[PDB]
Amino acid sequence: RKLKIGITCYPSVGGSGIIATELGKQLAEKGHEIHFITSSIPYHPNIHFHEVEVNQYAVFKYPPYDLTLASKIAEVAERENLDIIHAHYALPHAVCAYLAKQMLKRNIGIVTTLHGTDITVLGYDPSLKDLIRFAIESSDRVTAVSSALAAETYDLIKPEKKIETIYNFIDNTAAIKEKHGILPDEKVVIHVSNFRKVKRVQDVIRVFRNIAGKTKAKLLLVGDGPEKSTACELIRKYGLEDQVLMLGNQDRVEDLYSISDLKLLLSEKESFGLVLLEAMACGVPCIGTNIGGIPEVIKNNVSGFLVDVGDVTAATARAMSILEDEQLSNRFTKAAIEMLENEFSSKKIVSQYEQIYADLA
Amino acid sequence: RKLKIGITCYPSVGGSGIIATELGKQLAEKGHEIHFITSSTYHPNIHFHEVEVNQYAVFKYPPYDLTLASKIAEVAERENLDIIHAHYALPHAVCAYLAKQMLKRNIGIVTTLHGTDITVLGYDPSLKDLIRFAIESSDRVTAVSSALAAETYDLIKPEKKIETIYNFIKNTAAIKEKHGILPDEKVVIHVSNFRKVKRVQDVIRVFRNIAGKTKAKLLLVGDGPEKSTACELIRKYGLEDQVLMLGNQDRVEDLYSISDLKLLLSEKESFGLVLLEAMACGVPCIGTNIGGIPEVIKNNVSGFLVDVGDVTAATARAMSILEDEQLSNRFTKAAIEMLENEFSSKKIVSQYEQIYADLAE
Ligand SMILES: CC(=O)N[C@H]1[C@@H](O[C@@H](CC(=O)O)C(=O)O)O[C@H](CO)[C@@H](O)[C@@H]1O
Ligand SMILES: CC(=O)N[C@H]1[C@@H](O[C@@H](CC(=O)O)C(=O)O)O[C@H](CO)[C@@H](O)[C@@H]1O
Ligand SMILES: O=c1ccn([C@@H]2O[C@H](COP(=O)(O)O)[C@@H](O)[C@H]2O)c(=O)[nH]1
């Protein structure tokens, strides 16, 4: 049964944005009518974009994006007769969905997906606890991208609400290596992140120093963010400028995972770690920290390795085990691919979102 | 029975900011407990609570509406507020509504319209339903004039009673000396925010005719976007030496005290708080025949009213006042008795108190 589904999110912060957009693309492919309600964007015929323009109107001291977004949700809900609004993030989107629902004369189902950013915000301003709780409680169905995010939510927010785990999902290496001046005999390590402190790039670099000081190696650092200059400085301090490619942000990140032999994600906080799936899909074995959602993706000594937060020497050892032992590497990669094709497959995950919409319609 | 009353507003935009803070000052004196909740000597029963809006790398816009709602809820619960009194439908009534859906308690929401919601709506017609929802989700709604009540009903159509409750309110040789005004100059004053709706260009033209018929100074008091337009027009008519651009001011009372005539020739004006100030200081007023201005000025009794844009009639009215001391003192006397009756703080504060009393129990 074809539904009309509104989706309200920030179209791209890194991981979440990609997930919401991708999810909309896959529902479109299944014949559903999808209506993104977002800030202006720069596609399938069943996907439509509605833009929220915020103005100050010379009355408002701060631009009222929340209220403007609520308004626009309600307007679209009504004109297009939406069955669902799917909000990504409790704040602001789930509260806006709620406001839009109270404006509408019609009932409409609200689904909210927590990606982790409500926990982050709560760390900056714990007084938002009640508002986040309300937003969760006022949704019809609430999902989280990991069981560990869900548990953390229950712990800090304590809502009277079942939070269901629905995981994230994902959609010529000689030439690419050549483009990037990587030689046939260099081992390629990759790290993709938004360079925030919680990512601990400094740990990624200390591990890579250890690596490149044993075998011959190149590090691909992909992304941009606040701790970039901390990264460079540390690259220069250790003398690794020839051996590291600061690629900034990238498109064609699949090209970069395709040429890599090892993926490091050594975060102190991580609700899921979408970058792990992408590397797994490209047959790149992973080491991650044993926090947050990471151990729901990497199964230790089965699909990759897990290490303690900050444990550089343990991650080095794991890293070499993998870089030398082609047999270990291949068994990891193959175990990872099996996860992709079952638990993390877009077909299974899009159907779990879809079952929620049908429940509510 | 003393009550605990939260007040959410922008604490000194201009008129509304003055009203909301004086109202709280006056309720404090009668022994109510007043909690201002805003983005920021005083009576001991007045308390201030500040909201801090931050993005935290998560939000694209700082969510002031959501943070404000969250702070109202928090103060409401901690202090057992009986009442939240919001000034402006947007954002404050909606923030108060949100705070009230968050509270385990019931709380009375009082919303006062000042006319900004009409301004917002002219700029963005799609916010109609939101403004309507904000009005209908308040428990009681007031408006600063019957003209605003009526225009609100005609433009927004809320199913909600809007009650009219009005706004409420020496060594001149030294002052005139200080501003270089000589003893034989007539002084005309205009106090506004220099928005386009104030028609400062009509005030200046009228002044221009006056100044060609008698020795005159014009005090233009305040700041805003059309200030530079005003300046230019002054230059064009050659009046630089006859006009004082005082910019924003405190002790506006000093300036009224040296003035013989006040012009308010707006094309939109819900109430016109500046008329009451000028009346209290013994200055006769000419206003346009719109919005609330006629609820304040009685034509030929306590000032004159003219049509919007009618420079000829304003000039002729201005000359009749500046030439006839008898007329002027009759206007000024009559104006002052209106102030003691219709626009007294004792009367208006008690009207607000009665609303609060109806809502608490
Ligand atoms: C810090 C954190 O929890 N980040 C999660 C979070 O990342 C955020 C961005 C961020 O907060 O760094 C996002 O992409 O919206 O959600 C991702 C997608 O669901 C997860 O894969 C990330 O692990
Ligand atoms: C243009 C307009 O309607 N202004 C009203 C409005 O003024 C606004 C400022 C403005 O938008 O001009 C305010 O001060 O909040 O509210 C005042 C207080 O009730 C009224 O005296 C003004 O007449
Ligand atoms: O330069 C970059 C940095 C990050 N990403 C993408 O941002 C997302 C980060 O998700 P997560 O690891 O925060 O969950 C991934 O899809 C990743 O490929 C890029 O496309 N280019």
Per-residue 3-state assignment (H helix, E strand, C coil) for A208-232 = HHHHHCCCCEEEEEECCCCCHHHHH
Confirm or deny that B55 is annotated as ligand binding.
Answer: no
Which of A55, A59, A70 is the closest to B116 by Cβ?
A59
Angle at B290 between CA B286 and CA B291, to 5 degrees: 120
Q: Which of B270, B274, B279 most suits a substitution to test ligand 2, by most atoms within 8 Å of the C-beta?
A: B270
Superfamily of domain A1-169+345-361: Glycogen Phosphorylase B; (3.40.50.2000)
A236-239 long-range contacts (CB < 8 A, ≥24 apart) are: A238/A205, A238/A206, A238/A209
Instruction: Locate B24 and state its tokens.
Output: 């709280």
This PDB structure is determined at a resolution in Å of: 2.2
Confirm or deny that B88 is annotated as ligand binding.
Answer: yes
CATH class of A170-344: alpha beta
φ/ψ (deg, to 5) at A156: -95, -30
The amino acid occupying position B313 is A
Nearest CA to A287 out of A254, A329, A256, A246 is that of A329
The amino acid occupying position A206 is R
Instruction: Please list the residues that pair with A6 across neighbouring strands.
Output: A35, A85
- Is the distance from CB of B302 to CB of B331 less than 8 angstroms? yes
Nearest CA to A279 out of A296, A298, A293 is that of A298
Nearest CA to A152 out of A37, A32, A19, A293 is that of A293
| Neighbouring C-beta atoms of residue A242, cutoff 10 Å | 9
Segments in A239-345 forming alpha helices (H): 253-258, 274-281, 294-297, 312-324, 326-341
Determine whether the interchain pair B129/A63 forms a contact, defined as Cβ–Cβ distance below 8 Å.
no
Per CATH, domain B169-343 is 1.20.1420.30: no
- Is the distance from CB of A286 to CB of A304 less than 8 angstroms? yes
- Strands A141-144, A109-114: pairing kind: parallel
d(CA A263, CA A246): 15
Counting DSSP H helices and E strands in chain A, the numbers are 15, 13
Segments in A219-301 forming alpha helices (H): 228-238, 253-258, 274-281, 294-297
Q: Which residue's CA is the closest to the ligand 1 atom numbered 17?
A: A15
C-alpha to C-alpha distances, B234 to A355, B218, B241, B249, nearest whole angstrom: 70, 11, 9, 20
Helix (H, G, I), strand (E, B) or coil at A35: strand
C-alpha to C-alpha distances, A77 to A83, A86, A337, B62, B131, nearest whole angstrom: 8, 12, 39, 25, 17
d(CA B304, CA B331): 9
Instruction: Locate B282 and state its tokens.
Output: 């013994």
The full length of chain A comes to 361
Residues of chain B with CATH 3.40.50.2000: 1-168+344-361, 169-343
Residues of A in contact with B64 (CB under 8 A): 61-62, 64
- Is the distance from CB of A113 to CB of A141 less than 8 angstroms? no
DSSP string, A79-147: HTT-SEEEEESIIIIIHHHHHHHHHSSS--EEEEEE-SHHHHHHHH-GGGHHHHHHHHHTSSEEEESSH
φ/ψ (deg, to 5) at A108: -155, 145
Which of A10, A57, A66 is the closest to B66 by Cβ?
A66
- Is the distance from CB of A199 to CB of A224 less than 8 angstroms? no
- Is the distance from CB of A14 to CB of A1 less than 8 angstroms? no
Instruction: Locate A279 and state its tokens.
Output: 């590397």
Verify whether ligand 2 is closer than 6 Å to residue B116 (CB atom): yes
The DSSP 8-state label assigned to residue B244 in this structure reads E
Which of left, alpha, beta for B73 (phi over 0: left; psi -120 to 50: alpha)?
alpha
Helix (H, G, I), strand (E, B) or coil at A265: strand
d(CA B342, CA B295): 10
If you measure from the C-alpha of residue B113 to the centroid of ligand 2, how many angstroms do you get, rounded to a whole number? 9
Give binding residues of A for UDP as ranges: 194, 250, 278
d(CA A255, CA A310): 29
Report the side by side order of strands in the sheet with B33-38.
B46-50, B33-38, B4-8, B83-87, B108-113, B140-143, B162-164
Per CATH, domain B1-168+344-361 is 3.40.50.2000: yes
Q: Which residue's CA is the closest to the ligand 3 atom numbered 3?
A: A223
Distance from CA of A104 to the nearest CA of B (A): 9
Report the side by side order of strands in the sheet with B261-264.
B243-245, B216-221, B186-191, B261-264, B285-288, B304-306
Instruction: Please list the residues that pair with A85 across neighbouring strands.
Output: A6, A110
What is the distance between the terminal CA atoms of chain A, rounded to a whole angstrom? 10
Residues of chain A with CATH 3.40.50.2000: 1-169+345-361, 170-344
- Is the distance from CB of B195 to CB of B227 less than 8 angstroms? no
List of residues 6+ apart from A84 with CB closer than 8 A:
A3, A4, A5, A6, A108, A109, A110, A111, A357, A360, A361
List of residues 6+ apart from A70 with CB closer than 8 A:
A96, A97, A99, A100, A103, B130
Helix (H, G, I), strand (E, B) or coil at A269: coil
Q: If residue A149 lies in a helix (H) or strand (E), which one and from where to where?
A: helix A147-156
Nearest CA to A91 out of B221, B230, B157, B70 is that of B70
